[PDB]
Each structure stands twice: as structure tokens, then as C-alpha cells.
């Protein structure tokens, strides 16, 4: 068993920025990791390719994954619209953590956020399931287009994504 690695190529108003790759902890959260892996390959007929990071707050995180509504109100898992909080073994310990956005207990869909800081107040409420393996510097450059209220000044999109390993 090896934990899957997936990648995103980020673009800023259609200009390619670079690739971020993530390790997904399928050994601790198999179902949440599988969901994110299959949405990154697009193998169920829908996913993250072409979607945007609709909310970026400098010093906090970058949120994306709403491929249906593109605004925080949509997205869906590969299991149906939403699924349960698998477990909360892992914590939001530093920059680079990958975690699920939600609207309350057991409302996981497709929306996720990449932490650029330790956010321990979300521990026990958001399921951590991966971490940035390479390209943390692309996440830092992404953060520059965010604002205190979350709106980005440039359109940040996932131009391509897929699984590496």
C-alpha cells in the first residue's frame, strides 16, 4: 500500500503558475482520500479540473472544490452529495495541511482548503486528509491574490489535475 499522490496545475487568469502535489493519507482516512483522488482524476465523470479557488484569506487558507456552483454553495462527493466525517485523528498542525470544508457535522462534499498556517480551532470539526508534498511555494504565491474577506483579485483555477502515484 502506498498513499496516493495527486497534483494540481494552478493558473492565474489563464496564465500557468505551477504544480502543487499532495500526499493523501489513505491509510488513516481511506474514504475521504478516495473521494479527493477520484475527483482529481475526473474518473466518475466530474471533478476539480477547470474549477476555481473561490476564497483565499492570506495567513489562513485557500478554499476550492466547488465545481458545480463555483462559489462555496456546491460540489458533491463521489458517494452522493455529502458523506460523513470519517474520523478526526489528524490535526491542523501547520502550513500545507489538506482538510475538508463543510457546513456542519457529516456534510462533506468536494470543497477542501489548504492551510497556510496552523489552525488548531478547526481540529475535531474538519477532517484532515492530506498534505502538500511539493509546490508549497505555488500555494504561497496563490495567497497573494486573496484578501481579508476571501475574494481573490485574479481568477485562480485548477487548469489540470491528476494522480501521480
Amino acid at each position: 500500500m502506498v498513499n496516493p499522490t495527486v497534483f494540481f496545475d494552478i493558473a492565474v487568469d489563464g496564465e500557468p503558475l505551477g504544480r502543487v502535489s499532495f500526499e493523501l493519507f489513505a491509510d488513516k482516512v481511506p474514504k475521504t482520500a478516495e473521494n479527493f483522488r477520484a475527483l482529481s482524476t475526473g474518473e466518475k465523470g466530474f471533478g476539480y479540473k477547470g474549477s476555481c479557488f473561490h476564497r483565499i484569506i492570506p495567513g489562513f487558507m485557500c478554499q476550492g472544490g466547488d465545481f458545480t456552483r463555483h462559489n462555496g454553495t456546491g460540489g458533491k462527493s463521489i458517494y452522493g452529495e455529502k458523506f460523513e466525517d470519517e474520523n478526526f485523528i489528524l490535526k491542523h498542525t501547520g502550513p500545507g495541511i489538506l482538510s475538508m470544508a463543510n457546513a456542519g457535522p457529516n456534510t462533506n462534499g468536494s470543497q477542501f482548503f489548504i492551510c497556510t498556517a496552523k489552525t488548531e480551532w478547526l481540529d475535531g470539526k474538519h477532517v484532515v486528509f492530506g498534505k502538500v508534498k511539493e509546490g508549497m511555494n505555488i500555494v504561497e504565491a496563490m495567497e497573494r491574490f486573496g484578501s481579508r474577506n476571501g475574494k481573490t483579485s485574479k481568477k485562480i483555477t485548477i487548469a489540470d489535475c491528476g494522480q501521480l502515484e
Partner: peptide, 11 residues
């Protein structure tokens, strides 16, 4: 505040 929700974003 600093939350990450999908739908009603709180302070």
C-alpha cells in the same frame, strides 16, 4: 472569524 464553511460563511 476564521471558518471554512460551504454556504453560510460566518465571521
Amino acid at each position: 472569524x476564521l471558518l471554512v464553511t460551504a454556504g453560510i460563511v460566518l465571521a
